[model samples]
Target chain A: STPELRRTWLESMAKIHARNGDLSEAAMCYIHIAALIAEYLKRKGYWFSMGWPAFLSITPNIKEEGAMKYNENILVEQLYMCVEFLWKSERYELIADVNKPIIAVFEKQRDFKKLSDLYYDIHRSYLKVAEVVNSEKRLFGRYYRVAFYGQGFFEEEEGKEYIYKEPKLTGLSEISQRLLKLYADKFGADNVKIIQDSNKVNPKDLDPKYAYIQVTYVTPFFEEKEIEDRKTDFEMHHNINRFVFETPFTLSGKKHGGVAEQCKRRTILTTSHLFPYVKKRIQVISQSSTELNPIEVAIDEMSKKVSELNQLCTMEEVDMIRLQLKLQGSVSVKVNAGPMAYARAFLEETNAKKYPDNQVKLLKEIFRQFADACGQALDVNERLIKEDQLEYQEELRSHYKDMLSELSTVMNEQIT
Target chain B: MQTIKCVVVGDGAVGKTCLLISYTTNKFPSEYVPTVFDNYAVTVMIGGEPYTLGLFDTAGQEDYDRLRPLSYPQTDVFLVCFSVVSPSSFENVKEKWVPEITHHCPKTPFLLVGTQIDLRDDPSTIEKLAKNKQKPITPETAEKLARDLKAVKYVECSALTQKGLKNVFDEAILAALE
Candidate 1:
């Protein structure tokens, strides 16, 4: 095959501008890149808004790394840029405020235990696989790298150095037990397993209006040390390796647990470090700072105008603008340690492992369940649903619009 | 010889397993949760000749999608549980859970059940539940949902009263008998 290559549209534009000897224009091109990133962040606000609520609906009392008053806009901006790169490549849809019904049902039931319980259950799949991978690597003294963000003191309370705990759901233990027994009686004990990974409640953030329940999941992975120990790394004709979170996550990819552990670590880390960090960063950035770049100022102005005219744009146009702005900002972030290259390398190696064809099959299946659960969480708007008994299958078109509005508010706050 | 395989599917805590328990042992647990996966089995009987029934009860939450799909193939009949008192369950029957079941097992005999009718009015509201009325679909909502799923049959029964119990089961059995 002749060497084939592809360049993203934005990259082409950057190259074109850079070649023309317009340093101002090139930086401005980069600035447009920055504005695009900001806009993309604004457009992508739905993911954060929807994701947190979705996670919360199930695990209402979640107190991950980012939940505290931490500030880390730079890292989040970097992630948004990564998300944008993924989007440009048509990787996944990252909407901010889509109503997830299954999550809503758990919220409605106030079953935070079930929520945390479910998170653990899902995490188990990866955890189990990771253990296998780690053990396999251990036998040969081979180790792979697992990348995770550092949890900073910004998340820690200053005076006591004690981590703050959020309030959790009170009535879920019985419900979970009852649900589990029902499963046991019908399907046999083997099919149904009980998991209660509920975390401790932090007393300081207790608010009567909303209850919080934290759910944590643990998984093992390949540490850098293990990678250095393995001899005859490619002793076998077919060498397999994996990376779970944009790092080389597996070696001897014979269904090693490393990838799974990577997935789990990132998931837990996301709630604590990644999610909180990103959210806090956005908050500070949006606080009307004097330190904003001119392009950022321009992007902010454009975002403000967009918000004011929420009614004017057609849905098609809105989604288009959302994608464009999202892509623009996404391409401008400075990724430390060349995460993108390694991410691609890991993704490619994993994709090429065993069978070259079914790279994301497991991930796709997992997401299908994810969507199904979301489909069940309908009344996500929290607009005016006050009935004791939920009314059946009411198709409210305005619900989507309301979600869009909600997305905008979160994005607006984030942009500010 | 023919067999009737009835599938009980619904959300967690909607009493899917409790209903299954009631059917198998005529036993009802006061407080029931739900099954985490498909805990189905073959119940054989030699009543008129030889017949086998596979009773598949599944978890109603989103986590069980993989297990949920397994229940559809070779399903002779379906019992989709919704709580009569919990309209969310009932609506989900109309919206997600039922449609998914029907689509996967099109042409299979099915019944929409509302579980836990006992937990009724004024007692079960989540603190932040909105006060909005989901407007009734005047134009072709039911038809649309039904047609979309290819679901020909519909019935709402409370497993708590065991009300409408005989008809739902017998009718499903009769359908299975075919």
Candidate 2:
């Protein structure tokens, strides 16, 4: 009677607290109820720590005075509600901490799928925390090491000591597969896909580096569509969600040249659509710019003078034009040197006095601007390289500092 | 319509049945019964191709040694199971299971499997092994035996926690496909 009364009173209070937006208080009330039920179960000779050691460790001790007896189902319900409240309050750490007992209960009830789902949720939350902590520590590269590395040992080599080169015995694939099995179990086996890396090579017929899982669901109509006669008609579309999970590792400090080329080739193959589109655009622009095509305009304009010279003068004028044309074409593509060289050759070959002075001034200005643009582009590339080098050095400094501290700790402990 | 026949052979009480049941049903068996050629089938997708994974279970007792190879013909792969916590079962992987499968289907590749990995870290299990002056086999050690025996690869799994359970079959399928 007393336990019933207290349970009813606390239930009302918990609802009121929840309504007032005091979620923590509501969660606390439920946690208290869970503890009471746990204690009652223990008193009734049905006590087992089960799989919830963490939950048991954290449960608060309630006074024995005025305790009420409650049904076993009520106790289980109260505990579930408590876990739900804690989960809803966004106290994931607490929920994660108490999941073992909750998981155990599900396992006992032959609800393996639900238990698997719960573990998956908890594992994901753990990963989120791990990701945050790792980023905070600037440990993107070393996170895999923490997961895969086993115990470390020092070796005496050449009258000195060095830590063993720890190999990654475990990998993300292992963790991913564990979760994958759970998912396959919860859902049907048809919905699950497991991709693995292999040591085999691809033949000319098939390449096998890529792996993916595709899921499709059919719907009656598109939410974005406004149909007329077919407003109620069924229309199918695919919402293919792609999840890319990458676990990084560096086999050696040097760049992997083979992998880099493979990646580059794959990039070209995958984005081949851009190739034709870009080529067509460039062709259209090039045709439109025939008048402004420095090489074409210069060649065409120079030939006109050569023809005029031939018509009015001798074969010597034609030979001079040919010599100038060869020299102009030899100018490098970096700067607009071809046009500049062509213009200068045109003036000199025809005699500078034969051309207008403004033409000479315009040609010189064009040369200066083109040369300046080339120099500016080179400068920007150099600046970027310098910035990248500076950042890399900073990373090296921090990495060395952490490594030094760890090594020193090992050394001092060894001395003891 | 491609079907890969995978036979599980190991010492009795090495959790061969539990492994199959857990993988097929996603539920751990609460009780143990001696198995006799128990079979399960599941359709698995590998690299976008569907394959029927025919899981054939066999008893490890000496009573059925002669009759066990009845299911070995046309076997695409074999999961030679052993319990990690039981050193004798681990020894039998090299001693009994490998010899049995290799003798019957010499061409068929098999994986050296260490089952009941969840109990590897279980305190009571460790304590019991300790009392017997033994310890659970480490993955490194199992890998060495697998290599020496020329098995496809060494894999470990926990039927209870389902850790590495999917990988066991995934690797089996890969070995069969190869």
Candidate 3:
């Protein structure tokens, strides 16, 4: 009676935690309830759904009659509720660990799609965690020293102190293989065989000149391999027999005694010397990365602001300033600073010296709008950094809850 | 209101006619038809103004040796054509075509044009050249010859695939404008 009361009280406390968005505490309470229920089932000779026998033993009423009357479905329903909460909490890795035994039970039905879904969830979570860890600020340094007894070519070495995070998609290959097996189970293997590569070649070993060259003429040089199901459509899959579906070329002609090998090499030998001309035609323009000078960058920013201000003042405004200045043509406004300051000095000069009441107002409004646009444009990068920081914090919180819940479940399950 | 007269002179069967046709019509001729004296005209845009680009295709045979220079007079630019896969055609570019164009025009600029460049990668063309222990003339070698011979520049094109075909005439128009 004390254990039952404890379980009920913990379940209510778990709900209270969840209401305050403390999903990890809720998960902790649910796992403890699950452990108590497991013990209660085992003492009554009913195998808990989490047990190995429940996963392995299939038919013929192996479970005790009274325990079986208690409905294994009810036990599974409680586990499902906890799993759903864990999943919704975005604690994918924890859900993946806690649901393994339940998945083992699902596995006996040969429901591969459900198994694939589980693998996908776990794989995605691994990638997500890797991304989160790697996204942290990693300060990199490069050390440079002048070469000993040599001209001014400095030796440089890049250094970074950060552990590289790799996503461990543990069973990804097996998951993919299982999917293919499921497809083969539905559609005959021969039909699926046409989808897979029948003939593979190492492109690196192939001649760089003939790396992607079509194999129509070169096909006679190697032992021909055919894809019987796939028809040859030369234009769409140009020289599909020679290049895409078969090994169209080899390293040398005399190496192989086969007629095809000899012919393939002979063709390559004739045309291989022409690769440089092809290279010249296909040469790409690349841009090298270089650091910005801090002083030059600040000067550029100042100049850019001035030019933008210049553009903001319409031709009419300049004309108006020139026309008004004719009243006192000798008065020249001079400001020995950046262009924006000079332009502002000119407007102020016109305003104080001689101008209509509204003319200077118009110019000031234009200047203010340009300044506002520049301020807003420059702040976008700052805005994004703030937004991303908030997003990252939320992700961290969810990750913590998932991890804690999973650890509690695993520990409780082990003891029970 | 102005026009640019471009004369193309090269060895027979070197795709001079095909090059002009592909440029003027944007359609590649499928057959190896040996050309007689033929002419094509297209309105080319240079500096936002349309100018008539008159392309004169001349026979590279001996019979036309006396007749080819008749079309050379008053020519704004000359596109001296050669097939890169043909060593003899490339040779004739310097030995015969340059001399004749200089003799007639005296000061008119010519572009040393290499035609049928698509065959540079063709197995049969490469194999034929190999049989004779020869290889196709490279772009660098042709560019060097163009410089030595006083042609404005060296440009190459493939009439079949239409690769660099437009550039051939565009360069000719530019040379004419210069």
Candidate 4:
């Protein structure tokens, strides 16, 4: 009857589902459970943090049984469990949804270690889901809505014309195929055009790249009529019915082909469109921008310094940044790292000097390496690589710093 | 284990993906998703010793002209395909696909493959071709081009029906081994 009781019941059901290996029945139970936790936190007027970890707005006094006892352990544990269950179901959206309160708590707690991880996790999940949702919607042949911000883009009032950019993986033939099916479902089979063309090139007759057969939907174009006009109030009413075209698409969703030409009149509405539920991960990333470990931090700071240096240095001085990042590096990251560190060190002596010398070349090269390592790592870890990925990253930093620990060695010149 | 990388390249909509998926996974795929890029691996037995066949596919579209070769540099053999029902695709076997692969992997052996043989005789497919004043590329004719291209051999397979699909890859491994 109560929210807590319902959550308890849901938990029992979830455990049952987990035991039975059927999460479909068990998956959404935690969503409600999370909702319950969020509600309790809200209504309690109580707050939490991790040490940051432990804090409360109100303390319970059992001597008089004066107030409700807020068990922090149970709340956190249940929230985490909710993440775990949802994770098994591949319900990444819910994983993001449930961790908000905790993310806030940790974020404020200055638990940068946790918060950074969370940010990286959240961002990476968005990266995956964002593209997927975008492509799926586009795949629906959202013709009228698709617009190109490509080379030439302009808009006008009542009748603005814009480009219908092709979907990334879906081609015109595929889009037209699905569109025909969609049209058929609303109308009938006879109207949709047979998507094809003549002028088939014989083998070796013309240039291969330049020569090809063209088709109406596949390689050709036209915007004949608004498909919606056919499905008017006249639809299902004999007197008001309109036969938009001669032969229509098959209602069967199979491609049969007839010419009821449809055009995407007026454009540009289409512009608007992973991994697991680790509670620790969820808390770190709910909306986390994420963070870097020490090496990544060292790497991160220099990019900022380099950005500053960009304003400070000339194109000639900053030119080598690409090759160091783009081509060379074992980790390429550390190969970039050591040199970047040297550059950063080098820059401390030079007040962003512009005029060239031999020392400038070496210094610029070093800085380039550092920037490359930083850039490469930043790019590679654009997704929150697991802890081991960061570990490998640090492995080089250790070598880098250790290489410096014995400064006298380079000075000693290996006197064996 | 020995592994052979067989990269498939052909003109757009020419059954390069179907032939690969059909031979590699052995079934018709659901809901056409044109391939810009994809790769697959199959564990095959060569007389009780194991060998790995790495099958890589590339989009035949010019949009991927820059990206296609990223999959080409490493190849033990190439399955240069054209749809039996697509005359335009057939012409590309020499004009585009052959020159592209040979230029990249001149030393690498290759097989000339005719894909979608089942569609060659389909009424709807034939009618579409007839309307366009085109005829499906005949096999004996394709065989001569294979010889003409100096490919290891010419292979024919219909990805839809699994006809001749196994031997296509079988010959690819043979191409790689030899």
Candidate 5:
């Protein structure tokens, strides 16, 4: 086991000692936990210390389960048992109930040759996973039973055309089966909620500042009336989209009452205002096509990189050099040249010669060039923002704000 | 109609006072002053929004316990300055300066400015030294942070070159409006 894990165990043991009223043991344990945490911290730094709070939540660590029959590793089931034990003891079942459907899915995987059974099993697993992960408290004990994942691995259903239940579904959910049924009438049952039992938690679970929308496109032929009937349900289910979430912000405290008549209109208002420059540019880029196609829209690929250049010296070249310098150091051999190399070179030379009083002058000039690059890049981004499609600016703005919102929630809250 | 008040903070010798002087009076003093708690105040409108720009110049040395409490509260924006040649000053800005600003003014938008860009040491040795130091935080880190903040902007400027001077004030005003 990792030293951190060992330290965690020792800390938990210390707490148990204290809880048992063994003062001497508790004191010794306390010293051990503190020392262990400090030693672990020395290796991982300030941020990787999120483990102990979670560890403290569950003291007297549960033992890992032996391999199971179907999957050899029954981590999920083991986790369920531990959670059930703790919650039952604590009388907090709702917070700890491993969604039975998810358990069934894992249990029934061997029996999933039939479509109905397979779909049902998948549904249960999705719901359970969603429910447990989102709970403020630990619901299931995944103690050594969970499968490991590699990078870039998004969750995937083994069988096609899943009818799996969401793991975290309640009577009325973010995406209730009833609402999905309503959508199915227009788009046909084919396009309906395929995973019936998967827990449909909002991305807002992780981040509060920004929410996400999950759009399930129905046939365009569906009666506009029927679409409107289920629009709120659709919007709520897909409330994860930036456009949908920020719609109210633009309309908030403004005189535009009916302006957000369509969800599309709502998106435009919130997004266009904040990122006027990028919003306009996106419109032009997208509009180059008579019928907005991938090739025409691909202009963003090139223009996206270009939009980062803000000032005369913000040639992509300088940014590359700076990034190299940041990652390597000033003495690095990394090189990236673009439109403004000569300018950065001249500025560097001039600073060294004229600004002899300042040691940090040359670096600052390089920094200036880098800023120019970004400002310039954003200037080009303006065209994309301007590229007129239907509510193009709004969509762009929503996306722009979404990324920024993510930073505040994830990066700023911790690392900064 | 409400206005946001922002303050500038940094070390004693890092030109925290001079930059504020350049900003408020539009003139350089060619001399440095050990800033006391309260320094200067100016008001500006950004996008039709009013913001009171209060420059709180404190002694960049110790007594942070005394000076910090006064500077931290109700601070909406922070202009954290660092002199270039003194890498220790830069590190101090990060360790002592930024933490103090954040402690007093959490959620406050900040701009990190590397001052005296126009001043490189021993013209002959600068390129070599710059080459040696390697990872230096340029003005770009500030801009990237600004973009990430969404409400603010960042730039690199020498009060001597007046390089990004205008952009800095504009961003400060814009930050207040936001």
Candidate 6:
């Protein structure tokens, strides 16, 4: 009997005794089985020094009925049980062990039905492998963003979104103006013109010293309402867009009766007069809209490469680069150029003469591994087809196979 | 009529104007005027001496970077306001609002006001706050801030419920006179 079969017999002996009585002997026998399986798993290419955690992680998952039905290994129902633990995709090189060599032999017979399941497992570790390389490119962008993103005014070590959420100027919120202007006409057109900028009182030509609704967003405001541009977009929510103006506008206190102050208030009060001039048109714009199309949008014939190539940069890797470019405030990339083109432009603006050498090396390795995954996906893609599509098959193969090889080739030739 | 100058300063939407609106307008008013004052100024009769109370509110000075404080505008007394339901506004009471006022008017007395106590014990409000792992500001914690920050006293009010609204005004008037 093989070590795995022999080990299984002893575990049955331990379980019988363990459930019956004299548990000390039972536990000791159980410990022996653990060490034995540890050695067997080690010899089968499963070794880890995670101490007790990894040791215990195995005991619960090793069930009875599920096992390999392979080779003279027809004991595969039992033997493949050992192989399942390896398929958990812990190591990136684990892809080296499975998802590939098995793919080559199976596809040589042009048998893609089985390759579909094989490629499914490959997709799980797919992006994670490229993620580490993109991770290297990220720190370079992150380390350099300090000129624009330093924590000085923001008060915390933060990112681009936090700074974007800053700024004193506002987009037009729900300030319903024609009525506001009509009401302010009772007070005066310039009455809503009482607001302040940091230190200025009532400055002109773009900077205001007070909360002045200078009325630029007029036709769009009324047109949007008349059209009732109420998006029933999924997950829609509203928040009041409040613009608080301290008015120095005053009226006679004895009438309706308010206004007049002696407070050297560093800045305060014009509301009594601004009151007839202005009241809340209740500036309400909503927060957030993204989920609506889940119903209206059904994605059919979505290319397998869309998501695969989408992950080529690893989302965070793409995110870090995009943020660094936007923060440059003056950077733009060529339209038809591929991602490597964008990467090169970023490196150009970054003015790094030292990075192109390593950057190319890192991404070439990335593309090579990515190309490995793509070949496996392409194999399965062919199996699902009815050769009528073969008219475009040459173009399809070139699209998947040649484009990537050329991408890697051009990326390499430019590595000066 | 002698005047009692009272200024309210805090981040926006902390129920600062609503407190004045509820007190002066004789009912909790909607669409709080940016600077709150009654249609008519009623003289608070302090021992039969009529004193006109002037209520003032600061422009919404809330932002990431401090808008430059323009040369220490004057006020006889300040109501350092924040909402009990808004924790960020509570934090600004110590970090931004207090220093901006006391640095400029070190001798002037002020009251620390916790507005929107109406929401403090509410389940809807609590669930929203609890979702963020935040609970309402308790009175015990706020009185300590009043003591440490040298505020005349700590007071709380609900502008809609008008629970402690008049007392907030009473405290502000006294915070001014004393």
Give the per-residue lDDT of model 1 (tens digit) for A216-333. Answer: 2111223466555433321210111221211112233221122222211121111222111111111101111122221222223234323423322323323322222122111111
Candidate 3, residues B1-178: lDDT per residue as tens digits?
2567677788877877667754554333432111111355665655534456776666677765754564454567898999999999988887898988898788898999998898999999999999999999999999999999988999988766556776777688888986
Error of 4 at A354 (Å): 54
lDDT tens string, model 5, B65-150? 45344434445577777766556677776577667766656677877766766665346436655777734455565456445544
**lDDT (10s digit) by residue, model 2, range A158-236:** 1121111111122233444543565556445554443222111123323233222211111122223434322211111
TM-score for each candidate, following the candidate numbering: 0.26, 0.32, 0.31, 0.32, 0.27, 0.29
Q: How accurate is candidate 2 locally (lDDT)?
A: 0.48
Ranking, lDDT, top scorer first: 2, 4, 3, 6, 5, 1
Clashing pairs in 2: A3-A68
Backbone clashes per model, in order?
61, 1, 4, 26, 78, 27
Ranked candidates (TM-score, high to low) = 4, 2, 3, 6, 5, 1
lDDT of 3 by residue, A54-129 (tens): 3211111112211321245555555566666555443444555556656776688798998887677667766754
| Candidate 6: segments with Cα more than 4 A from true spot | A1-416, B31-42, B62-74
Determine which window of 10 residues in candidate 4 chain B has minimal summed lDDT. B28-37
Docking class of 1: incorrect
What CAPRI class is candidate 5? incorrect
> How big a share of the true inter-chain contacts is recovered in candidate 3?
0.00
Could you tell which candidate, 4 or 6, scores higher by TM-score?
Answer: 4
Q: State the weakest 10-residue window (summed lDDT) of model 2 chain B.
A: B28-37
RMSD of each candidate?
29.7, 32.5, 33.1, 22.1, 27.5, 32.0
Against the unseen true structure, what C-alpha lDDT does each candidate score?
0.34, 0.48, 0.46, 0.46, 0.36, 0.42
Misplaced by over 4 Å in model 2 are A1-416, B28-37
- Chain A, candidate 6, TM-score of 0.22
Model 2 DockQ vs. reference: 0.01
Leading candidate by lDDT: 2
| Residue-level lDDT for A184 in candidate 4 | 51
